[PDB]
Design a protein around this nucleic acid. Structure first.
Ligand SMILES: [Cl-]
Ligand SMILES: [Mn+2]
Ligand SMILES: [Mn+2]
Ligand SMILES: [Mn+2]
Ligand code: NA
Ligand code: NA
Length: 314
DNA sequence: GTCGG
DNA sequence: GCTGATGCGCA
DNA sequence: CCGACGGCGCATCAGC
């Protein structure tokens, strides 16, 4: 991490803009800077050097000069010094507590995990769960364990129906050594009329075998919940998302959820060059959805040699 | 906050 | 009771 | 100087 000091400062600034200031555009601006600096192959010696980078402007360059010179930033020092900011920032670490709920709680005098634990009544189902598994949800997931989770998900899916396709995407599919969570895409030849229970079947099964232990949200296309490898020292509970998408939106969905949100941004960047527009559902000339029967295909559009998953962090 | 308009 | 309004998390 | 900057599935609940 050639410039981790700087990207950490920028990311703590972004979090503050999102969580306290509720300025989502600044939050994004700061994350854009952090990413262009994290991808930069030199050790930055000055703000003027960073300023060459797109996403890095006047203000950020100046903060960079201060950090490189002092090793700190007075603004972040001040922020972290304030009770309200620091408390609002912290509470958003609970899944289900956003900037609005965090700010409501703090104003009520509820500012800590203890306070939360001492006010179950003012928490909704999702927030109770994020609290219950606060530490767990902050832990990384070793690849060895992801491979084991993947096993259970593919197998139980098969047991419901021999046609379902399940693919684990996100950091996992990129070959990453650890994951923040598990992201599962699901398709089935019958869904491209409609039918209920298509996702519900898979969810119910995984519950039956005690893999999925908690539900955060659930509808006919998206499941958000908690899961755990069977057991010795219990394994930590983990976040899992499952998405049911139309079989004809498969590769666009897989490509998009594979991860490297960065990679996404710039494959989007080069999309509108040969005049294309790609989202998670389709690639369009906008026009009607161009035929997609591979990840290479989507590339074929904007020229562009096929990147394999484990290469697309960039 | 940054960048194109 | 209802539902329009809003919050939340997520590549 | 100034406006654009991603959208959506699902859950909750203030104000009828
Ligand atoms: Cl903003
Ligand atoms: Mn207290
Ligand atoms: Mn993930
Ligand atoms: Mn995810
Ligand atoms: Na710049
Ligand atoms: Na949160």
């Amino acid at each position: 991490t050639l410039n981790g000091g700087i990207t950490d400062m920028l990311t703590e600034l972004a979090n503050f803009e999102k969580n306290v200031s509720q300025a989502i555009h600044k939050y994004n601006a700061y994350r854009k800077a952090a990413s262009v600096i994290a991808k930069y192959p030199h050790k930055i010696k000055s703000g003027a050097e960073a300023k060459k980078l797109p996403g890095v402007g006047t203000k950020i360059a100046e903060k960079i000069d201060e950090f490189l010179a002092t090793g700190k930033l007075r603004k972040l020092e001040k922020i972290r010094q304030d009770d309200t900011s620091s408390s609002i920032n912290f509470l958003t670490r609970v899944s289900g507590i956003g900037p609005s709920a965090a700010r409501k709680f703090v104003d009520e005098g509820i500012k800590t995990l203890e306070d939360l634990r001492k006010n179950e009544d003012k928490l909704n189902h999702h927030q109770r769960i994020g609290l219950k598994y606060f530490g767990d949800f902050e832990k990384r997931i070793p690849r060895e364990e992801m491979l084991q989770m993947q096993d259970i998900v593919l197998n139980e899916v098969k047991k419901v129906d021999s046609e379902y396709i399940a693919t684990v995407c996100g950091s996992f599919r990129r070959g990453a050594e650890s994951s923040g969570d598990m992201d599962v895409l699901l398709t089935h030849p019958s869904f491209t009329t409609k039918q209920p229970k298509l996702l519900h079947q898979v969810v119910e099964q995984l519950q039956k075998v005690h893999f999925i232990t908690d539900t955060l949200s659930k509808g006919e296309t998206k499941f958000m919940g908690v899961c755990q490898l069977p057991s010795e020292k219990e394994y930590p509970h983990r976040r899992i998302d499952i998405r049911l998408i139309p079989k004809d939106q498969y590769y666009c969905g897989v490509l998009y959820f594979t991860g490297s949100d960065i990679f996404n941004k710039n494959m989007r960047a080069h999309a509108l060059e040969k005049g294309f527009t790609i989202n998670e559902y389709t690639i369009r000339p906008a026009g009607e959805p161009l035929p997609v029967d591979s990840e290479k295909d989507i590339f074929d559009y904007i020229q562009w040699k096929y990147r394999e998953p484990k290469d697309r962090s960039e």
